[PDB]
Design a protein around this nucleic acid. Structure first.
Ligand code: ZN
Lengths: 19, 135, 77, 29, 97, 91, 112
RNA sequence: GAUGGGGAAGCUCCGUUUCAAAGGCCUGAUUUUAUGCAGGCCACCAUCGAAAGGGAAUCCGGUUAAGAUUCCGGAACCUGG
RNA sequence: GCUUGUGACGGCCCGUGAAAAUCCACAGGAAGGAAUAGUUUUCAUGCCAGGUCGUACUGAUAACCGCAGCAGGUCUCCAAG
């Protein structure tokens, strides 16, 4: 659950961008 | 231009959430039947996430990172506007004029806004927003 | 001393099981300035404080005397 | 790395509060 | 001179006086120029700079207190800050003042 | 009606103390009780309160000054000497 | 016509030792010693009495609940509200000015 | 006005936080020396001196040859656990 | 109306008119708590406890001091037509 939760965050670092 | 917008970060000045940073979702320009003045719908955070470091791990980090959101209507005078900005599309359809009043629809709004603001904070972006203003 | 308005709240105090004794009291008074009427006052001895209940109507008063528990001591005037 | 932040400190002169330092030279015996 | 420029704007041009009414015109984005007195306190002044630089409005500092800024605009009550909503016949904003 | 010819505030003392000392007192008693301009407000609301202490009612500020006036003449000529010596040191 | 004594052994009119004359159920006048009056708590900055706080003697605050002594805003118990407003405004602008200092000083060193 | 100190042939005198080692708090498989205390934190000072200064909290009614905000009856509050 | 308590103001100073115990609040966040039952005894109700000494009466043209049951002296509260 936590390892699947992490890849969401590491996706959201790169994809979301902006200030 | 008119600078108060859906992006805009601001510091709330009066009333309970005083010196707590918010972001405007729906700026009403001039007035309504209730709230007879220039007022903005905002979505701040009441309890800031505490500091966190190399020493802490797993369960201590989850406790330290936890954020209470709030949502409120507020006067334009009580809001101090700020050069910084935050993207607001995660809680556009949530927060609205219909959403306020009729409780406990307010609670279901805050659960989505919690999942926005914590998840914004993990892989931290807008670092200034999630730091506490000290005064 | 502490007045109570509500009737439900009075029945809870009688079953609270520190209350050893109660006392009932009857007073003649005049309503508005038209006619006399027979007031009652159901007082109950708590450990800290004396709780009391003012009922104006005579019909509701007589049912309330029966509505007390029998195990509680009651003392007239 | 994301949640971790560098905050420095500026001990300097008037700014900040001085850390614990060895004062063995200065102790009143 | 600065008194001759402001003597035009009062008699033919839109304006507003005092702190609360200006900040509304900064928020709404109507104000083209604001004139802040010398003797106004610094937390008040440094707030008006920050509201201005978001809106990208020009900021002049009147060399003189709030009494004699009132004399310049030609009002017998003292005034700390003045804003210009619309320019008059004379040019005001395009000059260095 | 202006009630007295010359004595003014010093008429409280009445017949006592001699005319020359009463004139000395009249000079400084007019200064100390008179209101002065607050530099920071722009209001004529600076009352005296104890010797050398000058309370704005506006702003609740308190400024050090002279005993019987806000800025004595010696204090002003000091202040300009300090203005002069500073800009020599800078350049 | 009816006159009244001090109840306690102090016979002098001290700040503590004050009297109110009171009509009893017995139908005679009597002294009752009034305790000294509570001043308002102040705001430790602007210097004025501050709202939604009870006026009690200083020991008597220990009896009373939290919502009497506090108000819900940050710095609520101890600040004027208007003086809390100022320092939130001030903290925000001076902290923003500190970045404007730091950007200028870094560029100047590279030029020289 | 003791103490630490210093004067005085000495009865004692000076001085009161002063040229004093002037106590009491946290953590510890302090990781190996195998049955011995290790690592830190905090910073001024005895005591006496007010039945009018400061200060937790009680009122009514009744009663005695002579006592009561102290006894009796009822009704309250305060402090600590 | 009289006595008194309090409020907001005004005058006065080369006078600007005690301290400490005690209590509370605020900033800070060491850390501690739930999903099968915890956290709150600053909300309410309930249980137990409260030592030592003073307490009578005078307070004065007879109870105090003036050799006295001395026209002297001795601080203060209440205060009717
Ligand atoms: Zn001022």
């Amino acid at each position: 659950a936590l390892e699947k939760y992490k890849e969401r965050i590491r996706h959201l670092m790169e994809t979301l961008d902006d200030n | 231009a008119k600078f108060l917008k859906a992006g805009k970060v601001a510091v709330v000045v009066r009333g309970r959430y005083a010196g707590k940073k918010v972001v405007i979702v729906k700026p009403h320009d001039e007035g309504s039947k209730s709230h007879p003045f220039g007022h903005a719908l905002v979505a701040g955070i009441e309890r800031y996430p505490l500091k966190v470091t190399k020493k802490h791990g797993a369960k201590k980090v989850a406790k330290r990172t936890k954020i209470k959101p709030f949502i409120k209507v507020v006067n334009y005078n009580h809001l101090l506007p700020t050069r910084y900005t935050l993207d607001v599309e995660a809680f556009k359809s949530v927060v609205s004029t219909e959403t306020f009043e009729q409780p406990s629809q307010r609670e279901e709004a805050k659960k989505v806004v919690k999942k926005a603001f914590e998840e914004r904070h993990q892989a931290g972006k807008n670092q200034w927003f999630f730091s506490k203003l000290r005064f | 001393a502490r007045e109570i308005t509500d009737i439900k709240q009075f029945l809870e105090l009688t079953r609270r099981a520190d209350v050893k004794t109660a006392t009932v009291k009857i007073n003649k008074k005049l309503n508005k300035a038209g006619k006399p009427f027979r007031q009652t006052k159901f007082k109950v001895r708590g450990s800290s404080s004396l709780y009391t209940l003012v009922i104006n109507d005579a019909g509701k008063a007589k049912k309330l005397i029966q509505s007390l528990p029998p195990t509680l001591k009651v003392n007239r005037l | 790395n994301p949640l971790t932040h560098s905050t420095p400190k500026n001990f300097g002169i008037g700014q900040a509060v001085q850390p614990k330092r060895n004062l063995s030279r200065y102790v009143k015996w | 001179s600065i008194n001759q420029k402001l003597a035009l704007v009062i008699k033919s041009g839109k304006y507003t006086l005092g702190y609360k009414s200006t900040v509304k015109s900064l928020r709404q984005g109507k104000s083209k120029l604001i004139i802040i007195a010398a003797n106004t306190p610094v937390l008040r002044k440094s707030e008006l700079e920050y509201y201005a630089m978001l809106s990208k409005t020009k900021v002049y500092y009147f060399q003189g207190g709030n009494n004699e800024l009132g004399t310049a605009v030609g009002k017998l009550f003292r005034v700390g800050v003045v804003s210009i909503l619309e320019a008059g016949d004379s040019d005001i904003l395009t000059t260095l003042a | 009606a202006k009630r007295t010819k010359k004595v003014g505030i010093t008429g409280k003392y009445g017949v006592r103390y001699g005319s020359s000392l009463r004139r000395q007192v009249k000079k400084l008693e007019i200064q100390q009780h008179a209101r002065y301009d607050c530099s920071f407000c722009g209001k004529k609301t600076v009352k005296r309160g104890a010797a050398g202490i000058w309370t704005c009612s506006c702003c609740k500020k308190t400024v050090a000054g002279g005993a019987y006036t806000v800025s004595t003449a010696a204090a002003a000529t000091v202040r300009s000497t300090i203005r002069r010596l500073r800009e020599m040191v800078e350049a | 016509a009816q006159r009244v004594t001090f109840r306690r052994r102090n016979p002098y009119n001290t700040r503590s030792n004050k009297i109110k004359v009171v009509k009893t159920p017995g139908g005679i006048l009597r002294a009752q010693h009034v305790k000294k009056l509570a001043t308002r708590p102040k705001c430790g900055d602007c210097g004025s009495a501050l709202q939604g706080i009870s006026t009690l003697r200083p020991r008597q605050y220990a009896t009373v609940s939290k919502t009497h002594k506090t108000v819900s805003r940050a710095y609520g118990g101890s600040r004027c509200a208007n003086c809390v407003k100022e320092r939130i405004i001030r903290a925000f602008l001076i902290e923003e000015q500190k970045i404007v200092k730091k950007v200028v000083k870094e560029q100047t060193e590279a030029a020289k």
